[PDB]
């Protein structure tokens, strides 16, 4: 009566669409309520750390 | 010959399992290669910002 190929796609595509829409909209809404200090520090603390002598030549 | 209720579950459950396993193991492996400076700063820059007078009473 009905194809077994569409019965599986509808289940996964519909389940994936609902989960992606909910979880996607749930996390996408947190980016607007979050601060940009973790991004300004995300790339800053990643490989941009300060490394200078504060007391090696003038201090023993 | 076969139930249309299981044909959908197998598609979504199998697709969700493969996507969750791959994406899950893909992100879970990044936590071990990532630094804890974004977590030490995640809760530090969240609501733990410094606010003290550096020049208000002794400076005009």
Curated annotation (Swiss-Prot), chains A, B:
Effect of residue 49 to A: Reduced phosphorylation
Known tissue expression: Ubiquitously expressed. Isoform 2 is also expressed in ovarian cancers.
Spans through the membrane: 5-27
Localization: Cell membrane; Endoplasmic reticulum membrane; Golgi apparatus membrane; Nucleus membrane
Residues with PTM Phosphoserine: 54
Post-translational modification: Phosphorylated on Tyr residues in response to EGF. Phosphorylation at Ser-54 is partial and occurs only if Thr-52 is phosphorylated. Phosphorylation at Thr-37 and Thr-52 by PRKD1 inhibits EGF-induced MAPK8/JNK1 activation. Dephosphorylation by PTPRJ prevents endocytosis and stabilizes the receptor at the plasma membrane. Dephosphorylated by PTPN1 and PTPN2. Monoubiquitinated and polyubiquitinated upon EGF stimulation; which does not affect tyrosine kinase activity or signaling capacity but may play a role in lysosomal targeting. Polyubiquitin linkage is mainly through 'Lys-63', but linkage through 'Lys-48', 'Lys-11' and 'Lys-29' also occurs. Deubiquitination by OTUD7B prevents degradation. Ubiquitinated by RNF115 and RNF126. Ubiquitinated by ZNRF1 or CBL at different lysines in response to EGF stimulation; leading to recruitment of the ESCRT machinery and subsequent degradation in the lysosomes.
Effect of residue 53 to A: Strongly reduced phosphorylation
Phosphothreonine modifications at: 37, 52
Quaternary data: Binding of the ligand triggers homo- and/or heterodimerization of the receptor triggering its autophosphorylation. Heterodimer with ERBB2. Forms a complex with CCDC88A/GIV (via SH2-like regions) and GNAI3 which leads to enhanced EGFR signaling and triggering of cell migration; binding to CCDC88A requires autophosphorylation of the EGFR C-terminal region, and ligand stimulation is required for recruitment of GNAI3 to the complex. Interacts with ERRFI1; inhibits dimerization of the kinase domain and autophosphorylation. Part of a complex with ERBB2 and either PIK3C2A or PIK3C2B.
Protein family (similarity comment): Belongs to the protein kinase superfamily. Tyr protein kinase family. EGF receptor subfamily.
Function according to Swiss-Prot or TrEMBL: Receptor tyrosine kinase binding ligands of the EGF family and activating several signaling cascades to convert extracellular cues into appropriate cellular responses. Known ligands include EGF, TGFA/TGF-alpha, AREG, epigen/EPGN, BTC/betacellulin, epiregulin/EREG and HBEGF/heparin-binding EGF. Ligand binding triggers receptor homo- and/or heterodimerization and autophosphorylation on key cytoplasmic residues. The phosphorylated receptor recruits adapter proteins like GRB2 which in turn activates complex downstream signaling cascades.
Disease: Lung cancer: A common malignancy affecting tissues of the lung. The most common form of lung cancer is non-small cell lung cancer (NSCLC) that can be divided into 3 major histologic subtypes: squamous cell carcinoma, adenocarcinoma, and large cell lung cancer. NSCLC is often diagnosed at an advanced stage and has a poor prognosis. Neonatal nephrocutaneous inflammatory syndrome: An autosomal recessive disorder characterized by intrauterine growth retardation, premature birth, fragile skin, recurrent skin infections and sepsis, failure to thrive, nephrocalcinosis, and nephromegaly with tubular dysfunction. Some patients have chronic diarrhea, and necrotizing enterocolitis.
Protein name: Epidermal growth factor receptor
Portion of the parent chain present: 642 to 697 of 1210
């Amino acid at each position: 009566k009905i194809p077994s190929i569409a019965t599986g796609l509808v289940g996964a595509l519909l389940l994936l669409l609902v989960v992606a829409l909910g979880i996607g909209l749930f996390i996408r809404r947190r980016h607007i309520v979050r601060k940009r200090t973790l991004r300004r520090l995300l790339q800053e603390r990643e490989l941009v750390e300060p490394l200078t002598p504060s007391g090696e030549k003038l201090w023993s």
